[PDB]
Design a binder for this molecule. Structure first.
Ligand SMILES: Nc1ncnc2c1ncn2[C@@H]1O[C@H](COP(=O)(O)OP(=O)(O)O)[C@@H](O)[C@H]1O
Ligand SMILES: Nc1ncnc2c1ncn2[C@@H]1O[C@H](COP(=O)(O)OP(=O)(O)O)[C@@H](O)[C@H]1O
Ligand SMILES: Nc1ncnc2c1ncn2[C@@H]1O[C@H](COP(=O)(O)OP(=O)(O)O)[C@@H](O)[C@H]1O
Lengths: 375, 375, 375
């Protein structure tokens, strides 16, 4: 609180907002992106509740609330709800006066121009920021990495991409999309557990299943052989206590759930699994740069956090590639916050501080400015 | 009683067993699935009563008895009780020697493998059937229909499903579940009648309320406008004589009870009403097959028997679908026995007689056989 | 069905088989070249479906099926699938007995010798044709035209060529290749529509986009000025109803998609646009024959069907050529079937009937015969 200034790095996630100050090593505020007020709301004797805050309160308030994601699939679809999320971010989580900070916002891949313009309009008109930037989330991640060359497999919450990069450039024609990512894997685990006679269907039960997924699932060494071991499997049958206190047993569901990344037909997806899309992406590049891609396969995103994933990807890529090809899979430790960190590096870039968009630019060429000939 | 043979078609319902001979047009035996013996049992001077027969005796014996459904929510949960129901089916209702007849059994959606194996074990070991098949009840219904394409709304006793079908295949990812169906509507009518100062709480009173529901409830043309007419409603106020002989008056409860299918929040269900689930199911299918689904919405199940339901579904679907979409609701007349009829067609399928499971198959690969690579 | 005979003219296209009788004015059978069976195949209650017929059934059966082209990029790559396509052609579409008809087959430019030999082996051994010929598809088209001199721009489905011709001879060193053609333009329209927030990614969605391309795209008068008019463009914003019934709006995508033929960098292609390749081809010819080429630029192929293409080519060629050069663009009306018609003329050539290849020639010098010293 003086001269200088930082850069409000707000990564608008499909399920979680990550926000903080440029220059910090990780976001200081992480809260669910949802909207929820009592679904039954039966009055009582007073009030003192906040209608649709969701954020952190919701979670801990599981069972009372309803949820909505105004950013459900990564694109913002409800501007009144999004204004509530940004107000919460600035005033309740970070506890800042937004008019004192240049703010860098992230946007999903393929975000419409008109959507970026509405984001810009809200920042300047509603929150009175002195400036702002919009950054592409994949791009920020790439930034955080620091690798000019290599092929990234980025699997997050709602989408997975394979992005080959040569000298810093995402050759746009190589990238392929997959709908599936963590949101789909949590829904599939709810369904397969419901196969055993359990019942996980409510909003609260979804949260419970997301926790089982993140704590007990793993990727097999070989799907077929893991299924065969399931028979005499005395390991798989882990126990998990529900908040009600009942204890369920989870066995082959531990590896059947994430097997979907390699076999999208488990959820009905025709798409090619992540090892096939990696190969298909490398084959859309020049033959010449393929050796550099094969030796620099970088994993990113929350859904690449499973133990065993790098070894499995090494095995599968080795099976598809030429016999003399050197293959290397890199996974950065704390991948998931790779998107926020790239934003932090960019926003905290004094040297490129002219890329921030300003109140004068917005007034001159409206918000589009932050879209036409920059970010 | 000679060569050839029929197929024992036993549809194990949550509230009613439907059983008969393959090839008959409808089941010859329909009896409540319950277990009940005197709750007070005060001896007397002799016996000559059957402990927990339930079946038909129970009903007519209302007030003395207790009830249990070993198939309460569609999945068999008590094998000693289920053995009693099957013994009653074979020896008391159909009056057959089960060792002379291949028998097709039905099972609920999501029935565990181990449950199908126990059903199979009992048929072969306890009843000595020469063969048997297990069939999926929804599937049998689909079979009875005869429509390859279209979206079915099947509302029965304990569950309602929306199932889109293209060339005979239930695209498994499109189907959505609802807990609510007729069991819930009877419980809700007991509760709302208890609001007027009446008291319907016992087992006998539940049966009385199920009769009021089936004889006097109806679905409104528009819920809001029907409530508004309730004021000057001189029609609604129908009379119903209780077995005690008192006469109650039923008015807006006639349409408030089934309104729950369209507004599950009436019983506290967050779920989306049946018109919303229909739309949500069609939107999980390819855009291309949607025109075929919209023109082939087939209603099935006992809870789709209300007069007015097809016209209301036509109105609601028209309001959600594109303006140029051709919408058609089909309701087969005697829907409820749609499940038994599909079983009868399948079981009575000489041409597919190799799908029946045999005593040799059970002995070789145990009962699982009737589960792994068939039904 | 008597003496004489016709010539089975089968044009094996990358996406469509065109087949018929020599002497007919157009092919009587046109069906997609694909292979597809249920991707989900969920059994049901019977069969009566044909595993991977594709042909016409597929299309109308959009959403159920998968596709494969055994001729994906013009060269046949799977002989078991190709045998199915030829069986369908003869027995289901044309309804002929192939052993009664000399059959002329077409092959892509640069088809390997061994591939032509395998085509020949199948015709004689599998279908028992009395004779057969293999013809080069470009060549057949040239044949259909009837112009000895001039430079043809032939843009079809998977490839575009510029072919200068002087007295009937394709000076082989002048011809240049382009990967891009209609297959690429359909993929690019799917991608650019997905930019607006729509989602066209499935096999069924590809077919939908191919229809939007063929019905609503057009080539601009000037790309830069058309983009500038897009702003106040109230024309562009045509509506298109999807099979689901939703209605999308298409605007600048109408001309951005085919702009790729003139600017291959839109899809990442370094190649020179079709006006530059025309000029580059004319400059590889003698200076002396250039006046004849400039006055005889003939358009051929499905991708030259856009309204406005001849006028745009006249404008662009005029801008590159010497000021006193007479420039004329010819487009034959029903260009696309230009390949089949050339085959029909050739095959129906009684006078050159000795060029057909016979069962004795195949037996003597194997199939190669139809390759070494003829077609
Ligand atoms: N340790 C972990 N193991 C597996 N999945 C994880 C782990 N940590 C986070 N995830 C999942 O990663 C997803 C979030 O990843 P993220 O990269 O932030 O996604 P997005 O950027 O698409 O919002 C969620 O589905 C979450 O459950
Ligand atoms: N005419 C009717 N009107 C309304 N509900 C009916 C009618 N006939 C039967 N039902 C109800 O339908 C339900 C039984 O339907 P059914 O399809 O057999 O269910 P399930 O297969 O789930 O056992 C019961 O709740 C019953 O009261
Ligand atoms: N009227 C049209 N306008 C634009 N493209 C068209 C038209 N008719 C056909 N096409 C396209 O032309 C291509 C087929 O042309 P064709 O000459 O048969 O190709 P090929 O011989 O390479 O198989 C397809 O991409 C198709 O969509």
């Amino acid at each position: 609180d003086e001269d200088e200034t930082t850069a409000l790095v707000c990564d608008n996630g499909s399920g979680l907002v990550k926000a903080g100050f440029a220059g910090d090593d990780a976001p200081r505020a992480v809260f669910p992106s949802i909207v929820g007020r009592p679904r039954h709301q039966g009055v009582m004797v007073g009030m003192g509740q906040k209608d649709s805050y969701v954020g952190d309160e919701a979670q801990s308030k599981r069972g009372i609330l309803t949820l909505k994601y105004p950013i459900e699939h990564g694109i913002i679809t409800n501007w009144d709800d999004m204004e509530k999320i940004w107000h919460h971010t600035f005033y309740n989580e970070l506890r800042v006066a937004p008019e004192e900070h240049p703010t860098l916002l992230t946007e999903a891949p393929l975000n419409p121009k008109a959507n970026r313009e509405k984001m810009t309009q809200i920042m300047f008109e509603t929150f009175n920021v002195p400036a702002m930037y919009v950054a592409i989330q994949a791009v920020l991640s790439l930034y955080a990495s620091g690798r000019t060359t290599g092929i990234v497999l980025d699997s997050g919450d709602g989408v997975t991409h394979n992005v080959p990069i040569y000298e810093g450039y995402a050759l746009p024609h190589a990238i392929m999309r997959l709908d599936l990512a963590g949101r789909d894997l949590t829904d599939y685990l709810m369904k397969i557990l419901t196969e055993r006679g359990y019942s996980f269907v409510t909003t609260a039960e979804r949260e419970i299943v997301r926790d089982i997924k993140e704590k007990l699932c793993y990727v097999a060494l070989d799907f077929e052989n893991e299924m065969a071991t399931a028979a005499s499997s005395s390991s798989l049958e882990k126990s998990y206590e529900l908040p009600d206190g009942q204890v369920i047993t989870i066995g082959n569901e531990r590896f059947r759930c994430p097997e979907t990344l390699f076999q999208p037909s488990f959820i009905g997806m025709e798409s090619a699994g992540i090892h096939e899309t990696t190969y298909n992406s490398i084959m859309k590049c020049d033959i010449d740069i393929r050796k550099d891609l094969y030796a620099n396969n970088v994993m990113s995103g929350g859904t690449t956090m499973y133990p065993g994933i790098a070894d499995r990807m090494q095995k599968e890529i080795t099976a598809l590639a030429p016999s003399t090809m050197k293959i290397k899979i890199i996974a950065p430790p704390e991948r998931k916050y790779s998107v926020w960190i790239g934003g932090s590096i960019l926003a905290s870039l004094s040297t490129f501080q002219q890329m921030w968009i300003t109140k004068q630019e917005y007034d001159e060429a409206g918000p589009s400015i932050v879209h036409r000939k920059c970010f």
